[PDB]
């Protein structure tokens, strides 16, 4: 009978969770070894342990059928059982699983090992994305130099892994169907536990798209004055290599040439960080300070002992793309970041430490609940702190911003600077998954895979490649997450919900009142707020133990993902910018790109 079975089921779960945590620990150690030191041998060890854990998960899935778990009284027990039924890639036959891991390894190591020749010296051929190419893309205003680095990088990071990417799409699809999802798109979407989630994001995106179009138009206008009309057209998509980022995902690196009020201050603290002797260690210690200032958990000694916070100097290959790692024991949590002393890197440190904090908050949960309420929640945590850190208010307190007068014009400069990171990114992030979903769902023929990518980038972001591409190129894997098989919708979700978290934290901290001109949302610093700290604790400590609306409700009483808060933040910018574009007769919108030939 079922009452007795449910009692035994609870004990089965308790043991199985602990066993999965320990087995995952071992797989994580091997993955860490590889990612911090790419070698054929580390690859082999990583993929071998994953294969073994996959075989165990298959037995676990099979063993859950011995329990009438859908008949149980406990919502909690049923939730855990449901989580253990979901195998993902581990559902594949052993041989196909191994081929998928090999394919994944080939793509991620191709990405991490890209090097290109110096534009001014074709004997010097050891320039990596991080830091060398990224420095040129973010700093050079030589449009031909920029186009050179763009083409070299995309050809090597993108086109070179076409045939591997194709096999990955096939195996990803096969795995999804073995879990009885239509495709990998529905397998990813299942993490949001909401069958209207795509519609909800379309609705929110459509409400913010007008503001994006205004920013796009203004930036295009300013780039024309800088580079001239031979480089940038009034009416066409923006050539993406001029936007300060290899993927045009964020444009804050060209703020100095597009800022609303060039005579008025624009916050860029990198030079002061350098002047005051900041190191990667100091930046992490300051992030730790921020969390503990809010009455959240301090980093444990394992973090300091085992993290990698600067690029190795020993010539090894590694993945430099910044990441946070849970080892699934107690207090073994780590970051791997090739840290540089810049403003944007200070924000990255806070981003990654948000993942760390989450891990620490939920580490007492059962293994299956030791993850984010949804993938977007995980990405949002550290960004809520980065929003504070970026404020003039905070940057003056820590001595990084000197002689700053916050008049109306400085405020618009700062709002615009923020928008170049937070609004511009939204169409970018949506396209990353729209593209992959379309491949996974079998909606695009293989003959059209490259132009289907640039078509989306055109339609949603109004950008295009600097040179003509064709179906001979394959550009999508030039972005880390695409080569590395990391779902990207989490970042779209994060960029919306982080404003709901920020706004609520700010109110709880006494730092935001809509009816008080002294407390605008865009100068809120939650540093030192135990009240904000508490809201985080209430939410993060839940892990994935409840559906994400219940996690949001624990934070601020709401249950709905909403674009209201991000619009509220940028509202003064929207008003100003709409007026400025009219005043300057700025063209809005773009013709269809001709930069991808079929
Ligand atoms: C994805 O969807 C798939 C379907 O599209 C699904 O695959 C199905 O899983 C079914 C559930 O496990 C499975 O059902 C069993 O089928 C056996 C007979 O099938 C053979 O003949 C078919 C031709 O008709 C072939 O096509 C198949 O390939 C098979 O070779 C049955 O013998 C079997 O039965 C036993 O199991 C039930 C268990 O009953 C449940 O459990 C308790 C036990 O206490 C019951 O009391 C309770 O009420 C409940 O019924 C017993 O009732 C029975 O007495 C036997 O012990 C069972 O029906 C089915 O074969 C399979 N079909 C396919 C592949 O098409 C995947 O499982 C889905 N995957 C995921 C990840 O969810
Ligand atoms: C990297 O891994 C290899 C194993 O393939 C090992 O022998 C080598 O010493 C490692 N290097 C570092 C820097 O740890
Ligand atoms: C900090 O959190 C603890 C619980 O961990 C709580 O009891 C205490 O009130 C909080 N301290 C502050 C500074 O509010
Ligand atoms: Zn992250």
Author numbering: 17 to 614
Give the text the authors published on this PDB structure:
Angiotensin-I-converting enzyme (ACE, EC 3.4.15.1) is a promiscuous zinc metallopeptidase with a number of substrates, including the vasoregulatory peptides angiotensin I and bradykinin, the anti-fibrotic agent N-acetyl-SDKP, the neurotransmitter substance P, and amyloid-β peptide. Here, we present the use of the Drosophila melanogaster ACE homologue, AnCE (which, in particular, shares enzymatic properties with cACE), as a model to study the structural basis of ACE inhibition. The active site is located at the centre of this channel, marked by the location of the catalytic zinc ion, which is coordinated by His367, His371, and Glu395. The high-resolution crystal structures of AnCE in complex with the dipeptides VW, IW, YW, RW, and WR presented here reveal dual binding in both the non-prime (dipeptide-1) and prime (dipeptide-2) subsites of AnCE.
The RW-1 arginine shows significantly more interactions when compared to IW-1 isoleucine and VW-1 valine; this is likely due to a much larger charged side chain, resulting in it being able to interact with more distant residues. The arginine interacts with the S1 subsite residues mostly through water-mediated interactions, with the exception of the arginine side chain directly forming H-bonds with Tyr496 (also observed in YW) and a salt bridge with Glu124 (which has moved relative to Glu124 in native AnCE). The side chain further interacts with the following S1 residues through a series of water-mediated interactions: Ala47, Lys62, Ser339, Lys352, Ala500, and Asp501, as well as His337 from the S1′ subsite. The RW-2 arginine side chain forms the most interactions out of all the dipeptides listed in this section. The side chain forms H-bonds with Gln266 and Thr364 and water-mediated interactions with Glu150, Asn261, Gln265, and Gln361. The arginine also forms a salt bridge with Asp360 and hydrophobic contacts with Ala338 and Thr364. RW-2 tryptophan is positioned towards the S2′ subsite, and the arginine sits within S1′, but in WR-2, the opposite is true. The difference in orientation between RW and WR likely favours RW binding due to the tryptophan occupying the more hydrophobic S2 and S2′ subsites. Interestingly, RW has a Ki value of 200 µM (0.2 mM), showing a significantly tighter binding when compared to WR (840 µM). The favourability in this orientation of binding is also shown by RW having a higher affinity for AnCE than WR (200 µM and 840 µM, respectively).
